[PDB]
Design an enzyme around this catalytic site. Structure first.
Site, PDB file in Angstrom:
ATOM      1  CG  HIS A   1      -0.676   0.274   2.442  1.00 43.70           C
ATOM      2  ND1 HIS A   1      -0.767  -0.670   3.447  1.00 43.70           N
ATOM      3  CD2 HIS A   1      -0.151   1.394   3.013  1.00 43.70           C
ATOM      4  CE1 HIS A   1      -0.334  -0.140   4.592  1.00 43.70           C
ATOM      5  NE2 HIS A   1       0.075   1.103   4.353  1.00 43.70           N
TER       6      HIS A   1
ATOM      7  N   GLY B   1       2.296   6.218  10.143  1.00 45.47           N
ATOM      8  CA  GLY B   1       3.722   6.046   9.822  1.00 45.47           C
ATOM      9  C   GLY B   1       4.348   4.797  10.435  1.00 45.47           C
TER      10      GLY B   1
ATOM     11  CB  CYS C   1       2.492   0.981   7.588  1.00 39.85           C
ATOM     12  SG  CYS C   1       0.752   0.753   8.056  1.00 39.85           S
TER      13      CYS C   1
END
Lengths: 306, 306, 306, 306
Positions: free
Chosen positions: C41, C143, C145
């Protein structure tokens, strides 16, 4: 999935509604454990309401003078007490359907479900918000007094409203379950009037976040603003100021959408500033402000990508 | 006074909600006497909803394949049968909270309350109209299947809807409690659609009568008209036609209200042609069509459900 | 010699954390040999997340469209490929701090350490368990991820989690390092929700063994039970069933204590019925279930008498 | 979102851990520049810990008596000096992984990360609070002596603790990195005991502020109250007193929170008398006191350590 004004399932409250009669006066009572709560004006005639001495009116009443009916069964009153503008009747029997409950005082802009009752019998359940001027846009007829507003959280009912009266506008006034009026209203027949009302900005912002999730994005723009210049604008259109707490409460919808609270505020500033065309956002011609951020998150159940 | 979208007290229905599990699939069931009603697609796995043979899938299961939970307590299944698109599970125990009930099939434009349930636990209640195109604009998440719609009269719950599926549009499809779908929809994941949506004229007219009872008269037109005139303008504005049958049912709302029907239609014609533009009806800029004549009479006279 | 939730030393993972930027999107990457792993993503805008076609989105991207930073040094991308929900970027340089590593997929109830990172920079390390519903009760912001979960065994890091998303509850979803989600979750902005969670019984049993080793033994009783009856009881309190593998894994703690797995199960079954009179076990008011048997043995290095 | 007991990334400290051997005694040392810091009791044999003369024992040793290993490679000692309860061994080589560091002495109620090491090899990291009685509730086995505690700010490690010994209770005692014990403890086997024990009020208060930022708000009692009447009530539940300095340090959170100070104390008082009725805060039924205001700020804004 869709988006709709939903009320709480009313069953747990339905199990507490009773009828209270004092002389010629009947309204609704809430039966929790061995107490029945209702408006203290149950002890009043229409003439009494002109200059009401509640202390004298209550000393003259006995336990026998209170008829409490829970459908077919009569409940014996073994004690009567007064707390602020609400009355408390101690009875023979604890309500065996008593749910896990709390008494909370809600803030302007928060929402709750009303179970409109007559003669201790449920008529209807609807969703409403405590307006800024401490009124509710309800649906109440004669005999609705003692109807409660509530939220349900973990099989625990938070009772937040007890109905007392209707104002010239057709809006409604009442108390928390400790007897304290919301707003500058009193349980006596004198000239009262609801103050000028204002739009719940934080709720409008949640409604816009709901609009984005359900397909409507036309209103969104690139630009942002600072917090004070939005609030200045809000006063001009009769919108409540946005607290840092309100920004913080908007955090989850900001996270899912990927749209900053201050970004959404800028889009709202121009919707109000230029007015709008004949446009329905989320199938509404007018901005809806009786959805809280938590209401929208409850229904939309989206995810956040970090 | 006031006018709000009002749902029935949901308590009687809350007492009938159970969880039904078949393999890894869980949805909601309705527990009335010793029968549990749920969508037959509970037997369909997550992978297999494309085009299933329900007869074959059901014969390959026995009673032990059906796990029914009523809160904490497991209910033993002692029989399974299929009627149309609904599965009926006979259990060894009659729901002690079974209310007086009826199964009815409702007409397009009629209203009922939906109790949105998840994992057999009621989450919300809202008032809904069966749309002209046999859909409902509902609020449903995954796990909502088996949620029911209902009406109440006296002590008697009329179950009229069971939720089955969501369509591409985000609108919802289901059955009566005999398992027959409203509209031309099937419990298999295929390309199906009805977007034949119209505004329910008779409901809009009753909403205006509710507005008159509650003090909104700004919109009203002094002149009178003929029934033919409405149909032309209504088709242009996507509004269903009217009949003498509808007028006959509106007889009470031409009595205390004491106002003509075509006079209301003229007021609608001009307001639909050009917007109310800053003047609102019952707090809404938009004509609302999810109130029946009987809905307005129940709400404005405060009828209760024992 | 006390008992505490300890995480692995994070150093070997800290030497692999990098920042990955694609257009306006930045998250964390894992730099092992000449590959950088992150959530796919990263190639998506917030609009792309509504209906992402990752194959098209990736064919449109080039190698130089990926900015990979290991502190001050830029890493040149010489190849991009997708495996399930993780993106793999081949770079011209092998991480000289690459530790001995493995990619393992963990089971519900097993524990790992998370190094929460932002902009490829470590913020913190904590211990968590893969919940039965394939969620983790983490601590993650925007942030986070690409943050990884891991175990260290023999100077060899077993990577078992890569962070992707946060659910309505505030719990977290992610993948193994081959890009396969734990649970029925997808990297799309749609309505997802964590299933009802259950208590990791084998971990609760290990925690009780830890309680005995550190002095607290009040809860222990005279009696035993057989395995299935406890499992029946476990379902009632939302506890995972106890597999023979789980009994076998509990063998060492049984050996030191001299308390049979089935003996400890009986003590738990009775602290399950009526909870207990409010009091602390190992300094905790509630049963802790994010300690594995192997965690307890690692800390309580006791001896087995024979 | 989420809230976890989070420890600092331990990598910078991991790179400084060495093994120190004197006779048959081995424990952990800290290798910063060309100095190795360890407990002076490394010169004490197993038998001679009753009441040793450290000055005499150290003069009778030379540099060759100290074996320092940094993984496989032997470090030659070219000088030994004692400062308070810490031994300093000068080695011919500066640790090339020396981070930017500082030595600080922390106050009771401040937090740090412990890196539990054995034979110079890091096993675990956990977050710890210096208790009021100058002890830490740690997790230590034989071989843990010389394990350090630390905080990180920017790229700068603040070493604040070195582990020396375990008390009868199972709690732990050590020094700052200048060799001065926290509390009235001595590196000699005598009858010494912590005894004092309070809950760190300011830390409990910040934990509640963390609960609010993450969603849990069930507990709140939204009154105002005085500082004096909190102090009286808190002592009854064995909670430390509060200071305006503490209120001043809580100022930064109040900006984001938008929340009053005295409200939390009332909520704690009522939770202390109520048991929490089974409903939890950040997954905990017990007030947790090992989070400082700056711990909550670092974790809820995601600060990173380069």
């Amino acid at each position: 999935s869709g988006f709709r004004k939903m009320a709480f399932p009313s069953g747990k409250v339905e199990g507490c509604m009773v009828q209270v009669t004092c002389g010629t006066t009947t309204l609704n009572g809430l039966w929790l454990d061995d107490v029945v709560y209702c408006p203290r004006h149950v002890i009043c005639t229409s003439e009494d309401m002109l200059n009401p001495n509640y202390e004298d009116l209550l000393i003259r009443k006995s336990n026998h003078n209170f008829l409490v009916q829970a459908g077919n069964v009569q409940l014996r009153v073994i004690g009567h007490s007064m707390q602020n503008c609400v009355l408390k009747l101690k009875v023979d029997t604890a309500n065996p359907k008593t749910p896990k409950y709390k008494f909370v005082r809600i803030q302007p802009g928060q929402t709750f479900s009303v179970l409109a009752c007559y003669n201790g019998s449920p008529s209807g359940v609807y969703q409403c918000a405590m307006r800024p001027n401490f009124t509710i846009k309800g649906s109440f007829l004669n005999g609705s007094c003692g109807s409660v507003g509530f939220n349900i959280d973990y099989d625990c009912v938070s009772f937040c409203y007890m109905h007392h009266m209707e104002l010239p506008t057709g809006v409604h006034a009442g108390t928390d379950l400790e007897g304290n009026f919301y707003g500058p209203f009193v349980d006596r027949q004198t000239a009262q009037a609801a103050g000028t009302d204002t739009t719940i900005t934080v709720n409008v912002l949640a409604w816009l976040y709901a609009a984005v999730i359900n397909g409507d994005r036309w209103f969104l723009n690139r630009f942002t603003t600072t917090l004070n210049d939005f609030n200045l604008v809000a006063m001009k259109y009769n919108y409540e100021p946005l607290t840092q707490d309100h920004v913080d409460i908007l955090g989850p919808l900001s996270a899912q959408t990927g749209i900053a609270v201050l970004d959404m505020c800028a889009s709202l500033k121009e919707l109000l500033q230029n007015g709008m065309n004949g446009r329905t956002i989320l199938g509404s011609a007018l901005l809806e402000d009786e959805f809280t951020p938590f209401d929208v998150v409850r229904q939309c159940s989206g995810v956040t990508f970090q």
